[PDB]
Amino acid sequence: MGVWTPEVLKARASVIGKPIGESYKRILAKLQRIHNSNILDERQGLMHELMELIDLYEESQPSSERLNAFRELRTQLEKALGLEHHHHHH
Protein backbone atom coordinates (compact mmCIF):
# COMPACT_ATOMS: atom_id res chain seq x y z
CA MET A 1 0.00 0.00 0.00
CA GLY A 2 1.04 3.63 -0.42
CA VAL A 3 2.47 2.74 -3.83
CA TRP A 4 0.01 4.53 -6.11
CA THR A 5 0.90 6.85 -8.98
CA PRO A 6 -1.04 5.73 -12.10
CA GLU A 7 -1.75 7.92 -15.12
CA VAL A 8 -4.29 9.47 -12.76
CA LEU A 9 -1.62 11.71 -11.26
CA LYS A 10 -0.28 12.50 -14.72
CA ALA A 11 -3.81 13.20 -15.91
CA ARG A 12 -4.32 15.65 -13.05
CA ALA A 13 -0.97 17.34 -13.61
CA SER A 14 -1.36 17.09 -17.38
CA VAL A 15 -5.06 17.87 -17.01
CA ILE A 16 -5.87 16.43 -20.43
CA GLY A 17 -4.78 12.90 -21.33
CA LYS A 18 -1.70 12.80 -23.55
CA PRO A 19 0.60 9.83 -22.77
CA ILE A 20 3.89 9.72 -24.67
CA GLY A 21 4.67 6.53 -26.59
CA GLU A 22 8.16 5.39 -25.59
CA SER A 23 10.31 3.84 -22.87
CA TYR A 24 9.75 6.89 -20.67
CA LYS A 25 6.20 5.53 -20.44
CA ARG A 26 7.47 2.12 -19.38
CA ILE A 27 8.32 3.41 -15.92
CA LEU A 28 4.84 4.87 -15.63
CA ALA A 29 3.30 1.62 -16.85
CA LYS A 30 5.23 -0.44 -14.30
CA LEU A 31 2.75 1.06 -11.88
CA GLN A 32 0.03 -1.15 -13.29
CA ARG A 33 2.10 -4.27 -12.65
CA ILE A 34 3.30 -2.99 -9.29
CA HIS A 35 -0.25 -2.10 -8.28
CA ASN A 36 -1.50 -5.69 -8.51
CA SER A 37 1.96 -7.10 -7.80
CA ASN A 38 2.24 -4.69 -4.88
CA ILE A 39 4.71 -5.88 -2.24
CA LEU A 40 4.86 -9.14 -4.19
CA ASP A 41 7.76 -11.55 -3.72
CA GLU A 42 8.10 -11.31 -7.49
CA ARG A 43 7.93 -7.52 -7.56
CA GLN A 44 10.49 -7.39 -4.76
CA GLY A 45 13.19 -7.97 -7.36
CA LEU A 46 11.74 -5.39 -9.73
CA MET A 47 11.39 -2.94 -6.86
CA HIS A 48 15.18 -2.67 -6.70
CA GLU A 49 15.50 -2.04 -10.44
CA LEU A 50 12.58 0.34 -10.21
CA MET A 51 14.44 2.64 -7.84
CA GLU A 52 17.64 2.43 -9.88
CA LEU A 53 15.77 2.77 -13.15
CA ILE A 54 14.09 5.96 -11.98
CA ASP A 55 17.41 7.43 -10.90
CA LEU A 56 18.59 6.97 -14.48
CA TYR A 57 15.34 8.28 -15.97
CA GLU A 58 15.04 11.19 -13.56
CA GLU A 59 18.25 12.71 -14.93
CA SER A 60 17.54 11.49 -18.45
CA GLN A 61 15.05 14.22 -19.39
CA PRO A 62 14.26 16.03 -16.12
CA SER A 63 17.77 16.83 -14.98
CA SER A 64 16.64 20.38 -14.18
CA GLU A 65 16.41 19.22 -10.57
CA ARG A 66 12.75 18.52 -11.30
CA LEU A 67 13.41 14.95 -10.21
CA ASN A 68 12.53 16.31 -6.77
CA ALA A 69 8.87 16.01 -7.75
CA PHE A 70 9.46 12.40 -8.81
CA ARG A 71 11.48 11.82 -5.65
CA GLU A 72 8.12 11.37 -3.94
CA LEU A 73 7.59 8.27 -6.04
CA ARG A 74 10.97 6.86 -5.08
CA THR A 75 9.94 7.20 -1.46
CA GLN A 76 7.10 4.75 -2.04
CA LEU A 77 9.51 2.28 -3.61
CA GLU A 78 11.99 2.87 -0.83
CA LYS A 79 9.32 2.28 1.80
CA ALA A 80 8.06 -0.76 -0.08
CA LEU A 81 11.53 -2.24 0.27
CA GLY A 82 10.89 -2.05 4.00
CA LEU A 83 8.57 -5.03 3.58
CA GLU A 84 7.00 -3.81 6.81
CA HIS A 85 3.69 -5.44 7.71
CA HIS A 86 1.50 -2.42 8.45
CA HIS A 87 -1.58 -4.26 7.17
CA HIS A 88 -2.44 -5.82 10.54
CA HIS A 89 -5.97 -7.12 9.88
CA HIS A 90 -8.13 -9.89 11.35
* Cα 53 to Cα 83: distance, rounded to the nearest angstrom: 20
Domain count, the chain: 1
> How far out from the chain centre does Cα 76 lie?
7
Backbone φ and ψ of 64, nearest 5°: -75, 30
Q: Which domain holds residue 21?
A: 1-90
How many residues make up the chain in this entry?
A: 90
Per the CB < 8 A criterion, the answer to whether 27 and 73 are in contact is no
Cβ-Cβ contacts under 8 Å for 61 (sequence gap 6 or more): 24
Helices (H), 19-66: 24-36, 41-58
SS3 at position 84: coil
